[PDB]
């Protein structure tokens, strides 16, 4: 068959959760599309399945995401067709949605997060702890320090390398 997906170098997040933001503002009827009230966030991490894995949370849902790992050709598949995926977890069925800047991705919806409790706090947390229950396994909790550093000693491995 000639028709692919290609492989993702890393997770499309930030399209994953401005997609989100606007769906969880969308609403229909005299409810009225108004706001979230409730910063959506996604959480990216591990290559499980040989796949990106990744949860979305908003105010109105939890749901696992999972995008095809880097230098692959996946077929085209049809959408909101099902996957079966292993996981310590249990083999659980993941569905292949299709999304404005995220192209076709594997995901399932774990939860809806309607808690009185709940919080932007609660939102992060439980995506991340979601990823952990997924996984069945640690994984790191996006609260690390600051990463980043000045670049200094400039410079090519030259030689060999053309």
């Given at each position: 068959m000639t028709e692919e997906i290609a492989g993702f170098q890393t997770s499309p997040k930030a399209q994953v959760q401005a997609?989100?933001?606007?769906?969880?503002?969308?609403?229909?009827?005299?409810l009225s599309f108004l706001h979230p009230s409730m910063p959506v966030y996604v959480s990216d991490f591990?290559?499980?399945?040989?796949?990106?894995?990744?949860?979305?949370?908003?105010?109105?849902m939890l749901s696992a995401v999972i995008f095809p790992g880097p230098d692959?050709?996946?077929?085209?598949?049809?959408?909101?067709?099902?996957i079966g995926?292993?996981?310590?977890?249990?083999?659980?069925?993941?569905t292949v949605g299709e999304?404005?800047?995220?192209?076709?991705?594997?995901?399932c919806s774990?939860?809806?997060?309607?808690?009185?409790?709940?919080?932007?706090?609660?939102?992060?947390r439980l995506t991340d702890d979601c990823a952990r229950m997924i996984l069945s396994l640690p994984v790191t909790n996006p609260d690390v320090p600051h990463a980043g550093r000045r670049a200094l000693l400039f410079g090519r491995r030259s030689g060999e390398n053309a």
């Amino acid at each position: 068959m000639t028709e692919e997906i290609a492989g993702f170098q890393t997770s499309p997040k930030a399209q994953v959760q401005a997609a989100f933001e606007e769906i969880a503002r969308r609403s229909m009827h005299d409810l009225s599309f108004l706001h979230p009230s409730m910063p959506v966030y996604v959480s990216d991490f591990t290559l499980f399945e040989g796949q990106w894995t990744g949860c979305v949370i908003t105010p109105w849902m939890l749901s696992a995401v999972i995008f095809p790992g880097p230098d692959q050709l996946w077929p085209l598949r049809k959408v909101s067709e099902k996957i079966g995926l292993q996981l310590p977890y249990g083999t659980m069925t993941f569905t292949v949605g299709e999304l404005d800047g995220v192209s076709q991705y594997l995901s399932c919806s774990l939860m809806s997060p309607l808690s009185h409790s709940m919080s932007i706090e609660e939102g992060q947390r439980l995506t991340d702890d979601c990823a952990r229950m997924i996984l069945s396994l640690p994984v790191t909790n996006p609260d690390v320090p600051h990463a980043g550093r000045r670049a200094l000693l400039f410079g090519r491995r030259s030689g060999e390398n053309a």
